[PDB]
């Protein structure tokens, strides 16, 4: 084409002709500049004063191709650093994009959905500003069809991704009323069968379940948990990862919220998550298990009935370090809230030897956690007089050595608790 590899000054020259077609040629040239793999000259385009011009081409209904090329170019500028996105926002692009959502041309309205994604994705300020200019209704209106399958699927993947950026980020979280407004549509996309729509829906739901409990409540009350759990079942890691993150958020809430996930079947998928060959899934599953072990006795009991304690012993014994840390926490939590039977059982599954092994990590915080894991367990062995039998096993497998040495460690809690234990059970 005659619009390949132009110079910025050419683009300026055409954009300042007063000839709508030359403007179009030069805007298409800018767009192609801005779409190239290595290092598009975003700043020059910005310094040349192009943004107000592009922005005002958005409003030329009479001339749809220029609407589209300007949309795309502005999209790609807005895809840069914050500073580059501020330039696009500062040119007035937001209301002008919101207007293109109504375009009769699907390829143009799709480009506007996409640009607004890049803006909202910068941060909660821009996100909340896209929201204030009215974007949500017309976005939601685009999905108001009896069956999502009839929409082109590039199109649907865009809207979903955009919607999920309106759910994203955190100081502050998105406005409650915006959330209520978006949710029914999330719930529907979360049942659609495109893997990418599903990944992005789960991501939205994870962004919404990362805060305080009223926020989690809003999501739980929509009844998406069963569906999350099924997605947790999914063979595509790009779906499992966000599903697992949303499950994980949700069980940081109340016991009653945690129970919906237990009720939903979640614990049956754990054998497999806790042995997942993706390190990250294994970490997050463990993290999730640790907030389930911080619940009620009868919840700890379900972790027991599902056969998950061996999988924690497993993870304590061999996984990557950060996953072992989370496992330690699952253990300490289990040992605080557990009955005696339960804590006994945990010992019979073989928790002591791999717990001691970790005692020799250079991570000062894991050691504290392990320390009252032991402590809590000693505690329960007192209530059945078994401290002997217990002290022996700890002795038997290198426990006592590392422990005693602990005293000679720089810490307030470390040396206190180690010395304590030794003075209490090993003198």
């Amino acid at each position: 084409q005659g619009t390949v590899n132009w110079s910025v000054e050419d683009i300026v020259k055409g954009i300042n002709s007063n000839n709508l077609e030359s403007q179009l040629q030069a805007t298409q040239a800018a767009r192609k500049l801005l779409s190239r793999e290595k290092q598009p000259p975003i700043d020059n385009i910005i310094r040349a004063g192009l943004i107000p011009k592009f922005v005002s081409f958005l409003g030329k209904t009479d001339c749809s191709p220029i609407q589209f090329e300007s949309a795309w170019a502005l999209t790609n500028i807005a895809s840069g650093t914050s500073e580059q996105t501020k330039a696009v926002v500062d040119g007035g692009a937001i209301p002008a994009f919101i207007s293109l959502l109504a375009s009769p041309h699907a390829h143009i309205s799709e480009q506007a959905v996409w640009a607004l994604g890049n803006i909202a994705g910068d941060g909660s300020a821009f996100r909340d500003l896209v929201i204030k200019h009215g974007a949500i209704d017309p976005l939601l209106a685009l999905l108001a069809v009896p069956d999502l399958s009839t929409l082109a699927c590039g199109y649907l993947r865009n809207l979903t991704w955009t919607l999920s950026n309106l759910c994203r980020n955190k100081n502050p979280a998105p406005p409650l009323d915006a959330v209520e407004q978006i949710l029914p549509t999330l719930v529907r996309l979360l049942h659609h069968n495109d893997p990418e729509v599903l990944a992005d829906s789960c991501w939205a739901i994870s962004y919404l379940t990362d805060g305080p409990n009223e926020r989690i409540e809003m999501v739980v009350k929509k009844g998406v948990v069963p569906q999350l759990v099924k997605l947790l079942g999914a063979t595509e890691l790009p779906i499992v990862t966000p599903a697992l993150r949303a499950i994980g958020n949700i069980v940081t809430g109340t016991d009653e919220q945690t129970q919906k996930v237990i009720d939903a079947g979640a614990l049956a998928v754990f054998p497999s998550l806790l042995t997942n060959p993706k390190t990250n899934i294994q970490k997050e599953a463990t993290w999730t298990m640790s907030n389930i072990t911080a619940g009620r006795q009868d919840q700890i009991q379900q972790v027991v009935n599902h056969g998950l304690v061996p999988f924690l012993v497993g993870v304590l014994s061999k996984a990557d370090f950060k996953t072992q840390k989370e496992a330690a926490w699952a253990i300490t939590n289990y040992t605080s809230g557990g009955t005696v039977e339960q804590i006994v059982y945990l010992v019979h599954c073989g928790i002591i030897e791999p717990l001691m092994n970790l005692l020799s990590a250079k991570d000062t915080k894991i050691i504290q956690v392990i320390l009252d894991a032991i402590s809590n367990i000693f505690q329960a062995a007192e209530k059945l007089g078994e401290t002997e039998k217990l002290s022996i096993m700890i002795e038997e497998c290198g426990g006592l050595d590392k422990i005693e040495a602990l005293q000679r460690h720089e810490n307030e809690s470390v040396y206190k608790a180690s010395l304590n234990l030794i003075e209490k059970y090993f003198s």
Partner: peptide
Amino acid sequence: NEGSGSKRPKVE
């Protein structure tokens, strides 16, 4: 599987 892009460019 992994994070969702914050921003994306429509590419060549």
